[PDB]
Amino acid sequence: GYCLERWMLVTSDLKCFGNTALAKCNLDHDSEFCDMLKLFEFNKKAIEKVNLLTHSINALISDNLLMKNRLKELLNTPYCNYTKFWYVNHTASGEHSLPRCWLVRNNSYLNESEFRNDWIIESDHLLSEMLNK
């Protein structure tokens, strides 16, 4: 599917996400990961002068989603700050889920237990879709 470059990530590892996971990007309007992928794709094709990021920022970034996350932050509700995304990855198969946002409260990342139900169902959902094919 899409394999991100070294400069897009801080872990210094080759991360590539399959087309099966990334196909959900069009279906989901509340994915901040897909928005960040769109920014990185646009900047990637821009790097390889005039910069056209101001014209494409509405097409790449959902204003409503950013606004919702900002309002969640203003009310101390867990919010996405567009930096860290978690996904579930089947170690043996290599199949994974669409990376969801890692929420923040009080200027600190939400602990894994604090969204355990979020990554249980997702894991289960993966283990279900694998059996559908």
Partner: protein
């Protein structure tokens, strides 16, 4: 993180330096002081503060009526860029120049070496809710919580200062600012 016997919880963290190096960005030192940077390598910045003291009076200073560029001294080396960043801030605030109070800026013969743009957000100076409108815009722009707090004089002040790494670049603030200025030109 081991979710189960054959499933693992993994994460990725993005690095947004290359995407937002050359675009205007903003940062929040505290809930009253904010900084706007034209680009990462700029030696100057614009400070946006919520203050309780009047610094410019209508009796001695100029009011901004379609002549914002005059608030910057003609001898400043980055005069055009500073006026551009002021317009970016103004469009990010969603300022209504027909209805919102007229901003004040310093006199031409000011002794102080900084350009000041003052907006009176005291209750009753503008229409109902103007102060709340501006404070909620500050919350949306810089992530501030100034609005979620308790009739004294209050102003929104924009001054120019030297960039001294007062904060770290925040690409969410960059996205908010760029969304407010969609279609403009940024990136040299």
């Amino acid at each position: 993180f081991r979710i189960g016997r054959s499933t693992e919880l993994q994460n990725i963290t993005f690095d947004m330096l290359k995407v937002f190096e050359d675009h205007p960005t903003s940062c929040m030192v505290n809930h009253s002081t904010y900084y706007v940077h034209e680009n990462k390598n700029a030696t100057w910045c614009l400070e946006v503060s919520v203050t309780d003291v009047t610094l410019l009076m209508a009796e001695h200073d100029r009011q901004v009526l379609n002549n914002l560029s005059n608030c910057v001294h003609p001898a400043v080396e980055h005069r055009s860029r500073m006026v551009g960043l002021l317009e970016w801030i103004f469009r990010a605030l969603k300022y209504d120049f027909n209805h919102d109070p007229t901003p004040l800026c310093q006199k031409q013969t000011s002794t102080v070496n900084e350009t000041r743009v003052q907006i009176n957000i005291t209750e009753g100076f503008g229409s109902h809710g103007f102060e709340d409108t501006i404070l909620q815009r500050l919350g949306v722009l810089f992530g501030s919580r100034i609005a979620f707090s308790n009739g004294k004089k209050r102003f929104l002040l924009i001054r120019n200062s030297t960039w001294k790494n007062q904060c770290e670049m925040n690409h969410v603030n960059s996205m908010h600012l760029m969304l407010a200025n969609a279609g403009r030109s940024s990136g040299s």
